[PDB]
C-alpha cells in the first residue's frame, strides 16, 4: 500500500535535467543587441501612444519650459475610413 | 394569460415553466436542481434579485406586497440650501 505523506510536496520540485545553454555566436549577439535597440527606440516612436495624463494641479510660468513636445505622424485618411478623423 | 402570453400554450410543469421564467435560483429550487445549476454555470447567466423566490432566498424584502414602493420622510428641510460665496474665486 502507498505510504502517507505528512507535509505537502514542494512548490517547485527539483529536476535532474537542466536546460541546454543558449547558442553562442556573433549572430545571436547582434540579434540581441538589435532587439534591445528596437525596445529602446520604439517607445519614443510616435506610434507608441502613452496614457494621456490628466488632473493637473495648477498652471505655472514654467509650463512652457516643461511642455513635452514631440512630432505627430499624419495618418493617410485616403486609405483609412472617415470614422477615425479627430 | 400567464400561460399564453408568449404566443404558445406553456404548461405549469418543469418544461413549460423554464421557458416562461428566467430566475436561475427559482428554476433550481423548483426542480432539476443540479442540472439547472450546472447549465447556468456553463452559460454564465447572471440572475437578478427581481423574483420573489430569489428575494426570499437572499433574505431581502420582496418587490411584491409592501415592498413595491418606497417611503420618504416629511422632515423640515430646505432643498438646495444657500451656498457660501467664494471670495478668492
Amino acid at each position: 500500500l502507498p505510504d502517507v505523506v505528512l507535509k505537502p510536496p514542494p512548490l517547485f520540485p527539483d529536476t535532474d535535467y537542466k536546460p541546454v545553454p543558449l547558442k553562442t555566436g556573433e549572430g545571436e549577439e547582434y540579434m540581441l543587441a538589435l532587439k534591445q535597440e528596437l525596445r529602446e527606440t520604439m517607445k519614443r516612436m510616435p506610434y507608441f501612444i502613452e496614457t494621456p495624463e490628466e488632473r493637473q494641479d495648477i498652471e505655472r510660468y514654467s509650463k512652457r519650459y516643461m511642455k513635452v513636445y514631440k512630432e505627430e505622424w499624419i495618418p493617410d485618411w485616403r486609405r483609412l475610413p472617415r470614422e477615425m478623423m479627430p | 394569460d400567464l400561460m399564453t402570453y408568449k404566443g404558445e400554450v406553456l404548461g405549469i410543469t418543469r418544461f413549460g415553466l423554464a421557458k416562461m421564467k428566467e430566475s436561475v435560483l427559482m428554476l433550481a429550487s423548483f426542480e432539476k436542481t443540479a442540472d439547472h445549476l450546472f447549465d447556468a454555470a456553463y452559460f454564465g447567466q447572471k440572475d437578478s434579485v427581481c423574483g420573489v423566490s430569489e428575494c426570499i432566498i437572499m433574505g431581502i424584502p420582496m418587490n411584491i406586497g409592501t415592498g413595491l414602493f418606497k417611503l420618504l420622510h416629511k422632515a423640515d428641510r430646505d432643498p438646495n440650501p444657500p451656498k457660501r460665496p467664494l471670495i478668492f474665486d
Binding site: - | L37, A40, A41, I56, I57, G59, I64, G65, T66, G67
Partner: protein, 97 residues
C-alpha cells in the same frame, strides 16, 4: 431543531411561505425566514464577489473592497456548496439607494 424532545421549533413550510406571499406581508416574511431563523452577517469582496472572513479577502489578498452583508446562513451554506461543486456565485454588491 426538529423534535420537541430535542427542543425544536416550528417549521414555516412552503405552504406557510405561499400564504405569507399571498398576504403580501414582505417584512413579516423577512423577519420570519431571515431575521429570527438564520440571521448572520458575512463579508463579501466587491472585487471578486467571493466570501471573506473578518473583513479580509484571501483571494485578492486585500481588505478595501470587503463589506458586511446580511444573509441567511442557509443561503451562505448553499453558496459554499456551490463553490465546492465549482459553481462559483459571484456577488456584485451595490449601495441600497
Amino acid at each position: 431543531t426538529e423534535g420537541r424532545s430535542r427542543d425544536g421549533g416550528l417549521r414555516l413550510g412552503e405552504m406557510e411561505r405561499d400564504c405569507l406571499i399571498g398576504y403580501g406581508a414582505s417584512m413579516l416574511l423577512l423577519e420570519r425566514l431571515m431575521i429570527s431563523s438564520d440571521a448572520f452577517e458575512v463579508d463579501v469582496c466587491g472585487q471578486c464577489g467571493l466570501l471573506g472572513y473578518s473583513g479580509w479577502c484571501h483571494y485578492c489578498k486585500s481588505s478595501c473592497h470587503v463589506s458586511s452583508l446580511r444573509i441567511p446562513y442557509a443561503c451562505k451554506l448553499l453558496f459554499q456548496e456551490l463553490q465546492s461543486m465549482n459553481i462559483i456565485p459571484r456577488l456584485k454588491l451595490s449601495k441600497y439607494n
